[PDB]
Symmetry: C6
Subunit: 181 residues, 6 copies
C-alpha cells in the first residue's frame, strides 16, 4: 500500500504556512487560507489519516485526522459569522481552543521521540505554535501572535520537507533528503 | 490495523471540555463549541467509531459513533433556529434528550468494567456529566449546571488523558501513562 | 467483525422516545427530534445498516438502512416547507406514508420469529407504533396519536435495552442483561 | 455477504407507490414524494446497486443504481424551479425523458426472462408505467396519467412483495412468500 | 464482480439523447437535461467508472469517470449563472471546451478498435458529436448544431444499444444482441 | 487493478489548457474553468489519487490528490467572494499560494527522474507554469501571465498525450504512442 503520510504533511504544510503569513502580518485572513483549510489542510489531510488505518499506524490515524478536523473547525469558526449563524469568536475561548490543541500536540510530541527527527521538529514547532497562539489570544498580545506566525512558517515548511523527504526517498530507494532517521 | 480509540477520545474529550467551559460559567455558547461539535467531536468521532468495525470492537463502534452523533445533533439543535428552520429548543425537552444520553452512558459505563480503569472513570464521570446537565436544565437550576460544568471538565480531561495514554503506550511499547489497563 | 446492531438500535431507540415524547403530548414537535432524526436515528442507523453487509445479515442491512432512511425522509418532510420548497405535508398522505412503513415493519416482524425475544418486542411495538401513528394521521385522531406516543416511548426504551443488552453481554462473555437469545 | 436487493426493491417500492398516488389523483405532488425519492428511492436504492457489485450481479448493479438515479433526477426536475435555477419542465421533454426510461426498462424486462417471475412482473409493470407516463405527458392526456398511477401502485406493491419475499425466505430458509422461482 | 459498463453507457446514452434533442431543435435547454447530467450522466457514470478499478479496466475507468465528469461540468456551466456565481459562458470558450472533449474522444476511439464494434461506433459517433458541437458553436452556425444534434441522437442510441447488448448477453449466456464482440 | 493515472492526467490536463486559455489572454476567467476545476480537474483527480493507494504508488497518491485539491482550492478562491464569504483574493497572496504549489511540484518533478519521459515533461512544464503564474501574480506582470498561458497550454496538452499514451498502450499490449517508458 502507498504511504499517505506525505499527503497529510503536504496538506498540513501548505495550510500551516499560509495561515501564519497572516499571523506574522504579511496579509490579512484571506480566503486563500480558508480554501486550503477546507480541502488540503482539511479533507486531503482527513484522507491521509483514514489511510493510515490499513497501515497500522495509530499515530498517523490520530495525527492527520485530528489536525485535518482542526482546520475544518478553524474555517467554521471564521465563516459561520459571515453566514449569520453565530457570533464572532471570543479570543479567550479561541485561546483555550488553541490551548487544548496544544495539549494534544504536546502529548503527541512525546509520541514522536521514537521516530524520525523531522517529525519530532514538526510536532515540537507545532507545540510552540499552538502554545504561542493560545497565550497571544488570551492575553490580547498581538506581538506574540506575530511570533507564532514565524514559528508556524517554520513548522509548515519542515512539514512539507518531510512530506517531500519521504516521497523522494521512496522513489529512488535511497536518502535523497535526510530526515534524521 | 490502527487503534482508532485515541481519535474518538480526543474528539470527545476536547469538545467536552470546551462546551463545559461554558456550562461552568467561563464563557457563553460561542461558535468554537459548535465548530468542535461538528468536525472533531462529531465527524472525527464518527470515523473513529466506524473504524472499530473491522477491529471487532462493538463497544467502540457503538460509543464513538453515538457520541459523534450526539455532538452532531447538539449542534443542529443550536443552529437550526439561526437558520430559520426551527425555534429555540424547549429547555425541558433538552433535559430528557440529555437524560436519554445519560441512560445510554450509564449502561455503557457497566461495559467498561473489564476495560482500562481510565475508561471506567470517563464513562462514570460522563454519566454524572449528562445527569447534572439534565436535572439542572429541566428545573432551570443554574447552580448545578455550573456544577455540571466542572464535572465535565474532569470528564473531558480524563478522556484526553486516556487517549494520550493509549498513544504513548503503543509508541513506546511500555506503559508510559498508567490507564488502569486490565 | 464488530456487531453494528447496538449502534443502530440506539439511534432508532433514542429518536423513537424523543419523537413520541411529542406524540404523547408532553412537548411540541421540536428541533431536538429533527436533529436526532438526521444523525443518530438516521445516518448513524444508515451506517449500522451498511455495516451488516459484510456481516451477511440481509435482515439487518434491510432494517437499519430503511428505518435510518425513514428518519431522514421524515425530517425532510417537516423541514422542506421551512425552506420554501414544499407545502405542509397532507395529514392523510403522511398517514399512508406511515402505513407503508408499518407494512414494511409488519413483514420484518415475522423475520424476527427465530431471533432474540427482545428483538421481537422491538418490531412488534414498532408495527403498532406505525399503525397508531398512521391511523391517527389519516383520521386526525388526537387520542390515537397520544396512545401511539406511549407505544413509542416503550418501543424506543426497549430498543435501548436490546442494544445495551448486546453490548454488555459481549463485554463479559455471558448474559448480563437477558434478551431471550 | 448480505442480499441488498430487498433494500432497493423496498426503496423502489415505497417511492413508486407514493408517487403514483398523486398520478392516480389521491393527492397532489407533496414533499412526502420528494423526501422519499431523495433518500429511499434515491440514495437507499443507490446503495442497493453499489452493493450488487461485490455480488457479481450485473443486473442488480444496473437496475438499482439506474432507477435510484432516476428518482434523484425526478426530484431535481421538480425542485430546481422552486430554487429559481430552471424553468418548469416541458411535458413533452418529460414524456421523452419518461419514454427513454421506458426503453431502458423494456430491454431490462427481457433480462428478467431467466429470473424469478415476481421480478419479471415488476419490470413489466414498470415498462407499462413508463410507457403510459410517456404517452400521457406527450399527448396532454390526464386520463392516461391516472391510468399509469394505478399501474404504478401495482408496480410498487409487487416490488415491496419481492423485497419482503426474499427476506422472509432467507430468514427461515424456506418459501414463506412464493415469488415464482 | 459485476459488469459496470452498462451503467455508464446507459447514463451516458440516455443523457446524450436528451441533450441532443435540444441541439436538434426539438426543445430548449430544459431542466431535464440538467437533472440527467447530474445524477445519471454524471454521478451514476462516476460510479460506473469507479467500479472499473477492481475490474482492471483502465479504459472504462478513464472513459466513464471522465464523461461522468463532463456531464457534471456541463451542468455547472449552465447553472452557476442562475446561481449568481458566474456569468453565461463565452460561446467560443464552450467550443474549445467541447473540442478538448473531442480530442479526448478521438484518442479513446482508437482504444476501442480491439473491443466491441458497437463501442467503436459509439466513440466514433461521439467524436463526430463533439466535433460538430465545437465548430457549430465556435462559429455560431446553428445549422451544424442541428446536424450535431442528429449525430448525437445516434451516438446516444448506440450507447444504450451496447449497454443493453451487454446486459442480455450475460443474462442469457448467449449473444442476444450482436455488439460486434471481438 | 486498473491504472488510474490516465483519468487524473486527463482531468488535470484538460483543466490546465482551459485555465491557460484565459492566462494566454484569449478569454476571461470563465465559469467553464471553474466547473472543470471542480469535477474533472478536481474531484476526478481526487478519485484518481485515492485509487493509487491500493496500487502502492505513494507518488501517485500524493500528486493527483494534491493537484486535485489544488483545483478545488482555486475554485473556492474565486467563488467565495461571490457568496459574500470572502474578499477578493490578494494578488501577492495568490502568488505565494501558486509558489507553494510550484515548490511542491518542483520536488515531485525530481520524483519522475526514473519514470517515463512524458511524465517528466508534465512535471517540468507544470513547475514552470506555476512559477510564471506565481511571479506574474506577485509582480502583477501581464506579459508573464501571457507566457504562463502558453506554458500551460502545452503542459495540459502533453498531459493528455501521456494519459492517452497509457490508455492505448495497454489496449494493444505494445507501444502505440511512445511515452519514453
Ligand atoms: C462509490 C463506490 C466506488 C467503489 C470503489 C471501491 C470498490 C468497493 C466496491 C463495493 C461498493 C459497495 C458500496 C459500499 C461498500 O463498500 O460495501 C461494503 C460495506 O458497506 C459493508 O461493510
Ligand atoms: C469513513 C471511513 C470508514 C471506514 C470503514 C470501512 C473500512 C475501510 C478502512 C480504510 C479507510 C481508508 C479511506 C479510503 C479507502 O478506502 O482507501 C482505499 C482506497 O482509497 C484505495 O483504492
Ligand atoms: C466548512 C464549513 C464552514 C461552515 C459551517 C456550516 C455548518 C452548518 C451546516 C451546513 C449547512 C448544510 O448544508 O447542512 C449540511 C448537513 O445537512 C449535512 O448532513
Ligand atoms: C438550496 C436550498 C437547499 C439547501 C441544501 C442543498 C441540497 C440540495 C437540496 C436538497 C433539499 C433537501 C434537504 C432536506 O429536506 O433536509 C434534509 C437534510 O437537511 C438533512 O440531511
Ligand atoms: C436532490 C437535488 C435537488 C436540487 C438539485 C440542485 C443541484 C444544483 C447543485 C446543488 C448546489 C450545491 O450545494 O452544490 C453541490 C456541489 O458543490 C457538490 O460538489
Ligand atoms: C451557505 C452558503 C454556502 C453553500 C454551501 C454550503 C457548504 C458550507 C460552506 C462552504 C463554502 C465553500 C464552498 C466553495 O467555496 O466552493 C467549493 C464548492 O462549491 C465546489 O466543491
Amino acid at each position: 500500500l502507498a504511504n499517505p503520510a506525505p499527503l497529510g504533511l503536504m496538506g498540513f504544510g501548505m495550510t500551516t504556512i499560509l495561515l501564519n503569513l497572516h499571523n506574522a502580518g504579511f496579509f490579512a485572513l484571506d480566503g486563500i487560507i480558508l480554501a486550503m483549510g477546507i480541502f488540503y489542510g482539511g479533507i486531503a489531510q482527513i484522507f491521509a489519516g483514514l489511510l493510515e488505518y490499513k497501515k497500522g499506524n495509530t499515530f498517523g490515524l490520530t495525527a492527520f485526522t485530528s489536525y485535518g478536523s482542526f482546520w475544518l473547525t478553524l474555517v467554521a469558526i471564521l465563516l459561520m459569522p459571515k453566514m449569520g449563524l453565530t457570533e464572532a469568536p471570543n479570543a479567550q475561548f479561541l485561546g483555550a481552543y488553541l490551548g487544548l490543541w496544544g495539549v494534544f500536540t504536546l502529548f503527541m510530541f512525546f509520541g514522536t521521540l521514537k521516530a524520525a527527527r523531522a517529525l519530532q521538529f514538526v510536532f515540537l514547532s507545532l507545540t510552540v505554535l499552538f502554545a504561542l497562539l493560545a497565550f497571544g489570544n488570551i492575553a490580547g498580545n498581538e506581538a506574540v501572535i506575530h511570533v507564532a506566525g514565524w514559528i508556524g512558517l517554520v513548522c509548515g515548511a519542515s512539514a512539507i520537507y518531510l512530506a517531500m523527504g519521504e516521497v523522494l526517498n521512496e522513489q529512488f530507494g535511497r536518502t535523497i533528503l535526510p530526515i534524521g532517521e
